[PDB]
């Protein structure tokens, strides 16, 4: 197995997920117009958040420790049992919070209390989201790129079918339910694929508790908590700087660039958690880690650069196809943003190493470094160049950050503190 082959499997599943999302999104737009989209905005962002929140964000830790103990049946059972207990316990608590406070949640999502029933349904749907994401994370712990990809492919296709029946039956609220069911229905193929492929015995998923492993998986919850604040906060007051001196139109130009660039990054690095994270988890010697990091960088940097150059060449086609023709001025932002994306992908290689070593301390330092650099550059370039400055700030940020990642890796590899 290799990063390239894992990328081939993961690209196929990600492309189907993108095609399914574009299909469902256009069905929702044609069916319910801007009023339906504006009312679905918060609810859809909640569905995204639940993809990590429903299982308490331990998924990367599940992958990390399954990889570490993939040849240790006793510890592996403890790992999967504790992970099952943590996902079951948290998802159950989440379901109770949702059903008990369905009225305040509906008010915060839609502006009135008319969606309590949908919120109570989501309380059960997020269990499928949490459990499905756990099974995928287990497969990734075994570096099963094919099982992961086949599961997501079946789930996307059945998700589109479920969305069609759901909105045809129940109108707008049925459509929203289908949106929540898109990431939840993966649990059906994921469970089938995991058992059928002989990855682990089914009994491993029985909830158990191990205090040590629970504390270790909690480190990945804490990284998920930190990540959901720092850079999101950064982009929020980046938009603040933008609006302070420019129009909302320019703000929309930048937000459109950022959101499509983030989706581009998620598609491009999706195989990192499938291959890179479990592989680096198993390696402990500095020579072996360096070899894998160098080999990964030698593959991903030219591949992402070639892909991003192609995207920039077709930026007008990418805008006309992927986004609503209401700006068409974001083309000038593509170059800077795409360069920053190439270096950010390179910086992800070091970032997944930190994940693979469960280093909460280096995770904090990586996040604060990215936040502060983004802030120094945004505070400099945004007031002078608007959305173009925001793209320049993002690019300059990850030029410096990737260089910093290299330097810190060299100091760590040579054991500068010892």
């Amino acid at each position, epitope marked *: 197995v290799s990063l390239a082959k894992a990328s081939l499997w993961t690209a196929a599943s990600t492309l189907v997920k993108i095609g399914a999302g574009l299909l469902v999104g256009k069905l929702l737009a044609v*069916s*319910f117009g801007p*009023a*339906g989209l504006g*009312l679905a905005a918060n609810f859809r962002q909640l569905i995204t958040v639940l993809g990590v929140l429903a299982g308490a964000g331990i998924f990367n830790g599940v992958t990390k420790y399954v990889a570490q103990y993939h040849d240790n049946p006793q510890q592996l059972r403890r790992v999967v049992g504790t992970s099952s207990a943590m996902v079951l316990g948290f998802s159950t608590l989440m379901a109770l919070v949702f059903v008990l406070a369905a*009225a305040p949640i509906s008010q915060g999502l*839609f502006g009135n*209390t*008319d*969606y*309590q*029933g*949908l919120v109570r349904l989501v309380a059960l749907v997020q269990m499928g989201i949490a459990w499905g994401n756990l099974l995928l994370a287990l497969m990734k712990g075994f570096r099963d790129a094919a099982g992961n990809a086949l599961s997501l492919i079946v789930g996307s296709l059945i998700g589109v079918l479920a969305y069609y029946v759901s*909105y*045809r*039956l*129940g*109108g*707008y*609220e*049925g459509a929203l339910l289908g949106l929540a069911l898109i990431p939840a229905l993966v649990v059906i193929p994921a469970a089938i694929m995991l058992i059928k492929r002989g990855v682990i015995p089914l009994s491993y998923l029985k909830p158990s508790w191990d205090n040590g492993l629970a504390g270790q998986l909690s480190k990945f919850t804490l990284m998920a908590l930190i990540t959901s604040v720092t850079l999101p906060v950064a982009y929020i007051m980046m938009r603040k700087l933008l609006a302070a001196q420019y129009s909302w139109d320019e703000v929309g130009i930048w937000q459109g660039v950022s959101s499509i660039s983030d989706a581009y990054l998620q598609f491009i690095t999706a195989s990192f958690s499938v291959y890179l994270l479990p592989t680096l988890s198993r390696l402990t010697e500095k020579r072996d880690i360096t070899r894998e990091v160098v080999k990964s960088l030698k593959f991903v940097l030219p591949a992402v650069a070639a892909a991003s150059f192609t995207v920039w060449l077709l930026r007008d086609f990418a805008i006309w196809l992927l986004l609503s023709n209401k700006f068409t001025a974001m083309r000038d932002l593509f170059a800077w943003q795409l360069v920053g994306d190439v270096l950010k992908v390179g910086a992800y290689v070091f970032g997944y190493l930190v994940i693979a070593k469960a280093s909460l301390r280096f995770y904090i330092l990586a996040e604060v470094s990215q936040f502060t650099l983004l802030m120094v550059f945004a505070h400099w370039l945004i007031p002078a160049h608007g959305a173009l400055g925001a793209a320049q700030a993002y690019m300059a940020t990850y030029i410096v950050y990737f260089s910093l990642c290299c330097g810190v890796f060299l100091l760590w590899r040579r054991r500068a503190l010892e």
Partner: nanobody, 125 residues
Framework: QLVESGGGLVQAGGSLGLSCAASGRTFSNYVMAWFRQAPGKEREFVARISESRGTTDYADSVKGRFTISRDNAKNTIYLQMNSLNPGDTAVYSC?????????????????????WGQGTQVTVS
């Protein structure tokens, strides 16, 4: 987009007529509905008239007692309420939405109607 008229303090057993006017242009394509919300509960479905064949739907608590109708000439809808019992005391609101928002069986869900009126009070002594 929607304004309500009628209602108030009415003696139990007496009749009452609510009416709702709509602005805009395209009105014959909007499904029209009445909802009510009593003090302490949530918005519940009352009655609904379609945009096409003039079909009607009623909650089981108001069937036979309440009758919804519409007039596409003046873009208004009405709710006749006979045999008013104390359980009918609530704020009544008219709602408008397109048939794609209701689907096949979602016509009773208030979240499928994005356009609402201010609500008129009905108190059955």
């Amino acid at each position: 987009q929607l304004v309500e008229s009628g209602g108030g303090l009415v003696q139990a057993g007496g009749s009452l007529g609510l009416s709702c006017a709509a602005s805009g242009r395209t009105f014959s394509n909007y499904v029209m509905a009445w909802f009510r919300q009593a003090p302490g509960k949530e918005r519940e479905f009352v009655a609904r008239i379609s945009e096409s064949r003039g079909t009607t739907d009623y909650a089981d608590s108001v069937k036979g007692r309440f009758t919804i109708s519409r007039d596409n000439a003046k873009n208004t809808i009405y709710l006749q309420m006979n045999s008013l019992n104390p359980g009918d005391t609530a704020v009544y609101s008219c709602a408008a939405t397109l048939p794609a928002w209701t689907g096949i069986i979602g016509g009773r869900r208030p979240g499928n109607y994005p356009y609402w009126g201010q609500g008129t009070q009905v108190t059955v002594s």
